[PDB]
């Protein structure tokens, strides 16, 4: 599972709902949650690509009506080696 | 029109009349004429099948009565 | 006795009466009583063709008004040697 | 076979016509001729079921108009073992 | 069983029908067949009062339209010991 | 006793009612209980023809309005020896 | 068995269908086929009278709309020892 | 006690509601749960008579509106010894 | 192959047209041409069931309007082992 | 022999009738008969796509008006290797 | 916790959905899955009354449109010790 | 894989069609075919999330008009670890 | 659990009905019964918030019509440490 | 017996009357007399269910006209374990 | 506790009111208060499912009219084990 | 035989008539005569259910107009073992 | 069994039927049958109170229209220890 | 009145 | 088998879908792929006649709406021996 | 990986863009580029079903605006072993 799913949200309540729905829908590992600023929060998950697709489609649906809602839901199936440095990488 | 000896029921004979006009499927020794010349449904009734091929809980009862800390 | 005779009934009470009328109406041999599921019971007899025809007309008249009733009365004068695998040989 | 054909007649001349007809029509065996009394003669044949049906329809037609007539023509596809004691095993 | 059931018929073909019907219908015992004379034949069964009642009712319907027909259908629940001398112990 | 009495009911509660009623009403022997399928349960009693007739009449009235109800109430005074293979010898 | 089943047809196609529908239907043996002349072909089966009638019935029903049509469908329940000479006793 | 309460229902969810209600209402013992077929489940309790009447009026009210419903609720104050063979002694 | 195709025709010319069409339309083997009598000629092919269907349908279309025409076109996907004796093994 | 034919019927009598018709009509081996619950029985054949397309047509014709009828008549011309685990083997 | 929440559905797909929905929604443990018969499947969870209340609400909504649907949803805040015998402990 | 796809049907014939379409469309594994009773047959497949989505889509389309049809097509990209104890591992 | 449930009643007989109902319905401990004066009796049940909710609702539904009746049914999910000094820790 | 029957009346006098009546009428033991206060007095009887119901009914009829009157006469089939502690449990 | 409660508000002053209303309302622990960015403050509480249900309703009602207001009020009865890594354990 | 038949009459002359009629009519066993008091005399017979039914019907007609007459004619097919203590084993 | 149940009848035939219906309707013990003189017969049962009530309602309905009839049906749930001297302990 | 468990007949019970 | 099936498409993507849908559908061998120029690609399959009819229909439906689509789907059941030279034997 | 993903383009520049975009978006292998003729070029990739889904979507987006464009984008998640012959193993 080297795919990445991301869900930006307006506020943290929407993001914890997204992380929960994502990790409850498919075999995706929560790697990180981030505070972008301006009220933006980004939860990131990593798993096989199809799993990440299912997870991020389910997270978006769950987080869309909680709080101020979904800003973005994205999948990058292969992240470049450089982008791994700017990515949280901290299930542990 | 079968010819020769006939195994279909006849007026004089007695005891062979049983189920004469009843329609029995399949190879029939009995004549087609005497017996006579698409079912799409399940005849028997299973109560679950018959009905339809919201929550009851302890919490549900006595709604009007309770006073206290509300929840949602 | 290579002919097969079969009565299907809505219940076991018509099936037992059918098995009684069939086995007393001609020289047939009761070989099988199957619960097919759903309240379908099939009594199967095996005898010469005339014996079987007489037996199955007698069984059908016997169990037509017993309980829920007769679903099917059916004679097969010669059964393929392959259908004889799915046919029971002794009533259990 | 064990099926039983029985033809009663008013006389022995309508009974011999019936026995000849029955025992030429199908593969049946003449098991007996009984003088009942009152001028009633019974010719009893034993064969398989279809054989006996054919024989007893051949006998009835034959003797219907020979002598004083035909009283009965009856097939019993299986006979209780009890009834076999009251039935003739050979015609002498 | 001590009860007597007796079917008298005009001829032997109806009597054989009644004896088969009776023996099959219940747990009676075919105890004798008698050629009375004048073409009357009496079949006699011995069983329990419930058995004989069930048997004679069936024999009466069986042989009512076989040959000349039924003369009598009768049930004696208990026969006097004197009468048992004129009753056949076994069929002949 | 050789007679069979059989009560089919929609469900087991009516069948237990019919079995109690039957065993109490006469000297029959509860010989088996069968779950046919589709919610049909058959209770079978064996006793004399008088006993079984008395029992089944009582069982039919007892369980007619208990649960879903009576499907069939039937009496076979004598079962063919072939049929006794598909009949339970003792209740399970 | 010694019963004979005969189906006469106008043409060969209608008699290979009748011969096939016969031997499949019941326990009969195809003893032969004859080109009578004038466009008639006769297929004959010798089998027990236990099942011969059956085959004839099935075959007739089948070839009645095949080809030009059916001419005769005849059952003989016992064949005399002298007709045996005019009948094809064939491995064919 | 030896009294018998029996509650049939259309499902196991209305049966567990009934068992809980019955076994909390009075001093009754749950002796069995039987899957009849067709979606019929029977919960049988054994207690003294008043205890079982109370338990079976508590069970019926409870499950009347849980799931597909209540079919039967029946008390048998004494059970023939015959019927005890067809009754469950423990719920496993 | 085990399937049988057969086209009866009024004359030899419609039949040679049928055989040619049939044997070019699919992988079937001409096993016989038979002068039946009365001016009926029957052409038989043995192939796989699918080939015989394609072939017989082709033969019917070719000979329908040639000469006196087609009498019958028939497919027996599996002839009984006994019908094989009445069927030609190679053409004459 | 890789194709599958499958007839589902409402009862065992229509199913045995379809099995007979299918096995007689083409080159197909009867691999199994499955009781599915609720009164559905499924007769599966295995043969070539033409043998099978001819058997399942013949089978549905046989059992359409027999008993409660035909539910499904399906042909799978090539069966995936995985689906063969859920398919009865030919000794059935 | 010793509460009991139970969902009955028509089929397995709706019930596996209910079990998954429930075990994702709250702190409950799946203890059993039961095939009642006639297309009723009961999934059962044991937990704390708040958890089971939250679990059965989410499970009932999930399975309501999956397949044939929801029959029953039911919470028992305290189960009697006697119903523990008819209650599965761990899923089989 | 851990995604689960489940296609319930009304009968085994619509579920063998659904299983064939599922297994061929994507790299899934039939993990079990279930008879739930009532006629319901569930086909459960386990593969990667991308494969299971493709397979269930193919299965739902294939069996929609086959037999009595599709009840439910349902995908769970990851079941809870407690929902995996009520899931079959291998088909029977 | 710290949630408090309380049922004041007009009499001790409605209160005892309420204590029984509350205890049977949910996992709650009976902490005291208090004679307030004026014929008011309070029953206090301390457990977890869902449990106490279930208990109070069951108790109110029970004591509503028994005796003079229900004065109050109240839940306090957390009581202040001050309100503890006026709450009985164990019942007498 | 674990069952409890309770009677609350206005005044000690109706209470004494009812209690004495109960002791005499049925097999119940007078566990206790409690002054609810508010001029309500409750007398409690714990006994087997039978006696308890009868006694309670009798005491109610008994003290009804004596003094001000009968507030209520509750009957508990089974006390929950907890309720007992609140209840008077003594010879006293 | 296992249940998570969350109140998002626009400003700290609304959030402190929700934290106080929630913690006073039921037995929940204030596990975190987070400044998300852009003036969004989330208050997070972990307790039993019943308490967290009651608490989050108290918070939402309190902070709605305080200051700028409430953005969201969410209960997650059991977060996935993965979401625990992104949840605070103690407020800072 | 275990069945009881009992004729009560006003006086002994009708009772002796009924006892003679009963013993003569069937195979019952005169088991006792009881002088009740007030000029009521009860004759009791024990035999099979068929025998006793036949006997009591005859005794009821025999003694209906002898002396004062018949009070009761009654049949108990099976007496409870408790009742057999109050029944006379032999006449006195 | 301290409850007493008593039916008085005008004759012994209703009393014996009452003793039969009483002892078969509940777990009572028949203790006494007294001839009180004048054609009064009293059958006395002793069992738990519910057993006795059920037994005496059943006895009264059983003997109401048997013979002269029911004089009294009466239950005494606890008998004084002095009335037990004038009560028989074993039926004679 | 009658209070508590109802031992009285109910339409449902048979 | 020697039947030829030939799907032609505008492009190779539609052709690989057709080839794969033709090979999964029936027992057929992909014998070649041709680039004819002008965008056209022809996948050719060889097998028995029914295998090819079921493949060329599966292929056509599969590729009908893929890419620029289908130009031709055609079956030839037997090809002339001269057409075998312009047909590839194995794919390249 | 055994899933195939094929993009078809008009020209080679869009195809090289697709190859690059597909190979960089997912862990897929470029297996071949085929000049179909008519200026159609197919790029074929092979990897797991999720990687192939991602790769094809990436390729399609990327090539939609490079040159003449995208004719097709297709996935074959399982490919028959027959099609592996017409598929290119390595780009060359």
Swiss-Prot record, chains A, C, D, E, F, G, H, I, J, K, L, M, N, O, P, Q, S, T:
Explain the consequences of disrupting this gene: Does not grow in ambient air, has a wild-type growth rate in 5% CO(2), called a high-CO(2) requiring phenotype, hcr. Fewer carboxysomes are present, RuBisCO is found to be soluble rather than in the carboxysome. Required for growth in ambient air.
Query: What use has been found for this protein in biotech?
Result: Expression of 10 genes for alpha-carboxysome (Cb) proteins (cbbL-cbbS-csoS2-csoS3-csoS4A-csoS4B-csoS1C-csoS1A-csoS1B-csoS1D) in E.coli generates compartments that resemble Cb, contain RuBisCO and have its catalytic activity, showing it is possible to make artificial, functional Cb using these 10 genes. Cargo proteins can be targeted to these organelles. Artificial Cb assembly in E.coli requires csoS2-csoS4A-csoS4B-csoS1C-csoS1A-csoS1B-csoS1D (but not the gene for carbonic anhydrase, csoS3).
Specify whether Cell wall biogenesis/degradation is a keyword of the entry: no
What PROSITE patterns does the record tag this protein with? BMC_1, BMC_2
- Localization: Carboxysome
Q: Which of UniProt's keywords are assigned here?
A: Bacterial microcompartment, Carbon dioxide fixation, Carboxysome
Q: Which domain of life is it from?
A: Bacteria
Q: Name one Pfam family in it.
A: BMC
Q: Which Gene3D superfamilies match?
A: 3.30.70.1710
Instruction: Supply the domain comment.
Output: The tight homohexamer forms a pore with an opening of about 4 Angstroms in diameter which is positively charged.
Partners and quaternary state?
A: Homohexamer with a small central pore; the concave side is mostly positive electrostatic potential, whereas the convex side is mostly negative electrostatic potential. Forms a CsoS2-CsoS1-RuBisCO complex. Interacts with the N-terminus (residues 1-136) of RuBisCO (CbbL).
Full protein name: Major carboxysome shell protein CsoS1A
The upper taxonomy is: Bacteria, Pseudomonadati, Pseudomonadota, Gammaproteobacteria, Chromatiales
Gene, per the UniProt record = csoS1A
UniProtKB/Swiss-Prot annotation, chain B:
Q: What happens when the gene is disrupted?
A: Does not grow in air but does grow in 2% CO(2), called a high-CO(2) requiring phenotype, hcr. Cells do not make carboxysomes. Also absolutely required for carboxysome formation in E.coli. Required for growth in ambient air.
PTM field:
Seen in gels as 2 forms (of 85 and 130 kDa, equal amounts of each) which have the same N-terminus, called respectively CsoS2A and CsoS2B. Partial tryptic digestion and mass spectrometric analysis, as well as the presence of the shorter form even when a C-terminally tagged version is engineered, suggests CsoS2A is shorter at the C-terminus, but its sequence is not known. It has been shown these 2 forms are produced by ribosomal frameshifting.
**Top-level taxon:** Bacteria
Entry's localization field: Carboxysome
Function statement: Required for alpha-carboxysome (Cb) assembly, mediates interaction between RuBisCO and the Cb shell. The 3 C-terminal repeats act as the encapsulation signal to target proteins to the Cb; they are necessary and sufficient to target both CsoS2 and foreign proteins to the Cb. The N-terminal repeats of this (probably) intrinsically disordered protein bind simultaneously to both subunits of RuBisCO; minimally 2 N-repeats are necessary for RuBisCO assembly into the Cb in vivo. Unlike beta-carboxysomes, alpha-carboxysomes (Cb) can form without cargo protein. CsoS2 is essential for Cb formation and is also capable of targeting foreign proteins to the Cb. The Cb shell assembles with the aid of CsoS2; CsoS1A, CsoS1B and CsoS1C form the majority of the shell while CsoS4A and CsoS4B form vertices. CsoS1D forms pseudohexamers that probably control metabolite flux into and out of the shell.
Q: Where are the C-repeat repeats?
A: 1-37, 43-72
Q: Which residues form a coiled coil?
A: none
Q: Name the family.
A: Belongs to the CsoS2 family.
Q: What is the name of the protein in this document?
A: Carboxysome assembly protein CsoS2B
Curated annotation (Swiss-Prot), chain R:
Q: What's this protein's name?
A: Carboxysome assembly protein CsoS2B
Organism of origin is: Halothiobacillus neapolitanus (strain ATCC 23641 / c2)
Post-translational modification summary for this protein: Seen in gels as 2 forms (of 85 and 130 kDa, equal amounts of each) which have the same N-terminus, called respectively CsoS2A and CsoS2B. Partial tryptic digestion and mass spectrometric analysis, as well as the presence of the shorter form even when a C-terminally tagged version is engineered, suggests CsoS2A is shorter at the C-terminus, but its sequence is not known. It has been shown these 2 forms are produced by ribosomal frameshifting.
Biotechnology annotation for this entry: Expression of 10 genes for alpha-carboxysome (Cb) proteins (cbbL-cbbS-csoS2-csoS3-csoS4A-csoS4B-csoS1C-csoS1A-csoS1B-csoS1D) in E.coli generates compartments that resemble Cb, contain RuBisCO and have its catalytic activity, showing it is possible to make artificial, functional Cb using these 10 genes. Cargo proteins can be targeted to these organelles. Artificial Cb assembly in E.coli requires csoS2-csoS4A-csoS4B-csoS1C-csoS1A-csoS1B-csoS1D (but not the gene for carbonic anhydrase, csoS3).
Its annotated function is as follows: Required for alpha-carboxysome (Cb) assembly, mediates interaction between RuBisCO and the Cb shell. The 3 C-terminal repeats act as the encapsulation signal to target proteins to the Cb; they are necessary and sufficient to target both CsoS2 and foreign proteins to the Cb. The N-terminal repeats of this (probably) intrinsically disordered protein bind simultaneously to both subunits of RuBisCO; minimally 2 N-repeats are necessary for RuBisCO assembly into the Cb in vivo.
Subcellular localization is given as:
Carboxysome
Q: What residue stretch is flagged as signal peptide?
A: none
The primary gene name is csoS2
Mapped onto the parent protein, the portion here is 615 to 628 of 869
Q: Which family does it belong to?
A: Belongs to the CsoS2 family.
């Amino acid at each position: 599972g080297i795919a990445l799913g991301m869900i930006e949200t307006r506020g943290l309540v929407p993001a914890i709902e997204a992380a929960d729905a994502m990790t409850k829908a498919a075999e995706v590992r929560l790697v990180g949650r981030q505070f972008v600023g301006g009220g933006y929060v980004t939860v990131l998950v990593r798993g096989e690509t199809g799993a990440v697709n299912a997870a991020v489609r389910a997270g978006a649906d769950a987080c869309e009506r909680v709080g101020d809602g979904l800003v973005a839901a994205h999948i990058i199936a292969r992240v470049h080696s450089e982008v791994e440095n700017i990515l949280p990488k901290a299930p542990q | 029109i079968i010819s020769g000896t006939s195994v279909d029921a006849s007026d004089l004979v007695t005891g062979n009349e049983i189920g004469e006009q009843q329609l029995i499927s399949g190879d029939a020794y009995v004549g087609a004429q005497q017996t006579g010349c698409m079912p799409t449904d399940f005849s028997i009734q299973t109560p679950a099948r018959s009905a339809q091929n919201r929550i009851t809980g302890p919490g549900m009862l006595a709604t009007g009565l309770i006073t206290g800390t509300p929840e949602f």
